[model samples]
Target chain A: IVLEPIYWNSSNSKFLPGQGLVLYPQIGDKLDIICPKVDSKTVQYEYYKVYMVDKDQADRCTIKPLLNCARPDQDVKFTIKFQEFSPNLWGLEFQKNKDYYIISTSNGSLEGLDNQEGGVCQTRAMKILMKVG
Target chain B: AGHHHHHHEETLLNTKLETADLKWVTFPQVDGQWEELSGLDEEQHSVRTYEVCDVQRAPGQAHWLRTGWVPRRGAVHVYATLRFTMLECLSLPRAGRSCKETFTVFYYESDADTATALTPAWMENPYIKVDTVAAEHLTRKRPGAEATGKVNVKTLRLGPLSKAGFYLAFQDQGACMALLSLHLFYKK
Candidate 1:
């Protein structure tokens, strides 16, 4: 199941999202990103994968999930964006304060919504936060 | 009457779990703030490997997002399910390398050097749990959930579990793997 967060506006008891600080990892281990999808009545937005935008380079990305030994580190900050587009799909940018990169969702909960596709899922707004490097 | 009560409780627990579009993996960080991370960095460019990420100090690693429920009671059986993949793009890391992607259940396994065996200097972390759910502790009954899965076809001993807190861990120390779904069951 897709691991979501707690909530902003809740229903039952008041509590917290029990996730914690992410430790550093290898490129071969870290790059694979998961996109998010949710349903809100009419449409169940299809969430798809990461779209890497090189903000500084303005060049191109190979979408390489493999490790690039020749070129690993860079000076520019690139963005890997994930979105819930049209259907059966799922969904970053990078810098500063010497922190790492990785766009994450936190405090995620589905409130003010109902079940969809008879799925074990729901619809609601998720707060986006940076997993600081 | 006892049999009916047991069935009712099982139904209630199952119902308690398996809800939401993507179920909640509540973190224990913020008292009421379930989420612990979000958004993109530099909100800007092609983050090169060298400066962007590393295995050592920081990658602002969006490590495995964990849940907050610490098991308060002793568990007998478990149920777990999940989907996995590692074929990154046209190629995979290190070529023909198969995926060793497995989730670990971290339980408070007593302590070592605790000056003794009863309680160590530190804590022993192992076992499974996420959002307080351990992927259905299947010693058996797997393959019914997701591919490459297992459950305690019967019951597996979790020691006394008298004083244990179980949690699920996806990737750590950068030993990365990809997952599609996860479902856990509890037989208290």
Candidate 2:
């Protein structure tokens, strides 16, 4: 997945490795998200969470609202089309710097890009491509 | 397409001669030691040496025998080089004459598991014996200059019992070392 760098700010409330941000499309369509530089060494576990926008949309998404999680260290990135549920497709993006990660999944455990120092990022990319189709 | 699943299992053997590059000449010292005498293209790379006398060498020693070419999770090709030379010393009592021998170059390939097979293809039933020539024949001191044989890469296939684990064998010899390098590929 390609990630355009928005900026690098050391916010007092930075997202942890596993922690991520979600975006919803008003028409309930496909969405794409990307992350900046990801330090795999600090991220204990490798995965990203994708949450569906419920009728009761909250300020932030959590594992409880997590629809599907992708192992970024296992797969690739691509366009996704929704079929089963209205909120079946949600966009998740995370970027630290030049390094970025993205994930898309259906109504299941939220999965995200897991950029392990080496093998993890590529592995996750492949996993995502398989799911998109 | 559905998910593409991949899994690998490799087995190695305890026979050094099987996978060793026999094309190179080995100088067996009078003391029953083996060393490299000729037919080595040392310009490109440095040589390594190994000694295999114990039945169950320590993991460190065994690692040395295998030349430190252990397996990784997603490795594609396995490359290994071994250089061994037997030292010459005074032979005493039942001890034979001081001997020295060295294997200049050996190359093999398999998935990650093949690097550490207990009884890999090199040592399985119906095994293909490694062809070698006496050190005296290859060295200038000996009569024949071109007295060497090659170990075919096709013969490097893994055996049915081969599994992922380090393996190597050595006879009465001195200090030696094995150099192993790996090349891996995965979906980007």
Candidate 3:
């Protein structure tokens, strides 16, 4: 999965495309989320952050206590190995027929926009769900 | 009398395959970042190797690119999935002998004395040459015209590495090349 920084479209007050997706991965499969380098000069990219949230949190566009997150960095990749013995700190391993959700909480800009309903997760559509097989 | 019984259904999640520990490492794409050392001169006289461009580095002396040390991680066996491509010379109408280019991969078991292993004279370096392959092999057609470049995906089963860690050295024998990526997978 290529994780790109969500940018604010000033004209429509919308975030750039890449939202509302689902993934199905088998038991021994590995998922590598690659975050390509971004231009640090842009103001919108300054506060972009990614987090792993629950289904309830994702639905409400709320920021829960951080358990796992893909820190926004230049040319960084996060690897998730689907097995029982995976380390506890990093994100999460797969359990059969379970759902996982990830969302971004940043407004993609320095100042908050008035019309943004429930942060970027709801306004810009920066959430995805993964169903483990 | 009235009696009620509830039946419950549950899903079982399990795997028959034993879990194999997997990991990966990617070499950065920064140009002129890799360190190069001469096989003849002392380690102090060092130069840099570029990751993006292929240029001749003093030609006469054999050059070696040293990779950062990789830990053994308490695994008994190690395997590396090397995904990379090599860019060969494009000079045409050349003899088969000159067209043939080879590169060798060497491993050094690093320990407390790793810092002093390659110094003074590199002729007796501690790195052990493990594998050698032809980047530009002599082909049936006109030698230079057949093999200009090659993409390789090789799986090397390496073992008996020191628990402290080990380093990989790439020696270019009359050839120019670059590494795309390397993934190391190990098991106990």
- Comparing to the true complex, what docking class would candidate 3 get? incorrect
List the candidate numbers ranked by TM-score, top first. Answer: 3, 1, 2
Listed for each candidate, the true contacts retained, as a fraction, are: 0.03, 0.00, 0.00
Q: Give the winner by DockQ.
A: 1
What candidate 1 gets wrong by more than 4 Å, as runs, is A1-133, B1-65, B72-74, B88-90, B93-105, B109-160, B173-176
**Mind giving the per-residue lDDT tens digits that candidate 1 earns over A22-93?**
333322122223222232432323221222222221111112211111111211112222211100011122
DockQ of 3: 0.02
lDDT of each: 0.25, 0.24, 0.43
Listed in order, each prediction's TM-score against the native is 0.29, 0.20, 0.39
| Cα lDDT of model 2 by residue, B1-188, tens digit | 79987755432211221212222222232222232111112232211222222212222221212233334333233222222212111221122322223322233334353344333433322222222212211111111111122211212222222324222233233222111111122221
Tens-place lDDT digits, model 3, residues A42-79: 34333345556778888867663221122244443334
The digit string of per-residue lDDT tens for model 1 on B1-188 reads 45544531121122112212222342222211112111221212111110111123323332333433444344444444443222221122231222222333333332221222222112223333332222332111111121222221121223344434443333332222223333444554
Which docking class does model 1 fall in? incorrect
Ordered list by DockQ, greatest first: 1, 3, 2
